[PDB]
Amino acid sequence: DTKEQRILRYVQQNAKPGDPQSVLEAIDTYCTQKEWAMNVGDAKGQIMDAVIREYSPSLVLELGAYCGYSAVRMARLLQPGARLLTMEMNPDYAAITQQMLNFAGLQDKVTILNGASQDLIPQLKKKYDVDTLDMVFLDHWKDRYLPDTLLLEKCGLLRKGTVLLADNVIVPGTPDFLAYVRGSSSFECTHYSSYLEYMKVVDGLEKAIYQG
Numbered sequence: 001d002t003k004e005q006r007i008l009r010y011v012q013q014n015a016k017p018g019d020p021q022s023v024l025e026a027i028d029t030y031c032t033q034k035e036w037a038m039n040v041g042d043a044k045g046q047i048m049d050a051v052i053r054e055y056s057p058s059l060v061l062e063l064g065a066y067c068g069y070s071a072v073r074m075a076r077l078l079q080p081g082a083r084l085l086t087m088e089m090n091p092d093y094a095a096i097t098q099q100m101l102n103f104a105g106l107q108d109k110v111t112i113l114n115g116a117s118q119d120l121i122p123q124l125k126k127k128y129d130v131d132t133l134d135m136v137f138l139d140h141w142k143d144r145y146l147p148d149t150l151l152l153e154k155c156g157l158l159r160k161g162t163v164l165l166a167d168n169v170i171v172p173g174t175p176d177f178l179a180y181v182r183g184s185s186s187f188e189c190t191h192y193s194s195y196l197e198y199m200k201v202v203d204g205l206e207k208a209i210y211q212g
Ligand SMILES: Nc1ncnc2c1ncn2[C@@H]1O[C@H](/C=C/CNC(=O)c2cc([N+](=O)[O-])cc(O)c2O)[C@@H](O)[C@H]1O
Pocket: 038, 039, 040, 063, 064, 065, 066, 067, 087, 088, 089, 090, 093, 115, 116, 117, 118, 139, 140, 141, 142, 144, 167, 168, 171, 172, 196
């Protein structure tokens, strides 16, 4: 019994089917009063929701799905036609995520890509019918943030105005990524201080908008 599939079941036993909102609340309560998990959470989630609404992106790239929590948070707010692509290298995780989405009825807007970002990213354009991303949400291995950003930029997936939202910029932390993005003239950055999911520890999200 996986701690991951543990949650997947809880949602199936407590979430109002086809109701993204309910799913999110099920996942959060479980991780709050029982086992802890690396879900962005509701605090940072609300910032996500706010940023997403502002930019109302057409094409959004998620790096690291885990249990699909943020994939649901993001997809439930997508306008008709908008598609969300989420890369997950762990087959067990990409599995739970897919169900998580199917249960929220959000499955028609999300295309899950099982594999490692560094490998999948350069295949993105031709194999998935993609030109440029409108938004990118980074939440996978912390040492992968910078390399994938340089990778994303090399494959011409970044466009003037593309929005990069990054989680855990303070904890666990992503020094190199932050340093690179805030010092680069190709990125206009803004910080949004919040709290690490399920507990009161300072951590924030970083928005880095690509300028060209
Ligand atoms: N190169 C790659 N391509 C595709 N998928 C990949 C990938 N590298 C990792 N993944 C997947 O993304 C998730 C990684 C989460 C790391 N976050 C964390 O380690 C983390 C830790 C805390 N924390 O300590 O509180 C809080 C957080 O919000 C966190 O996201 C895992 O499900 C992993 O399988």
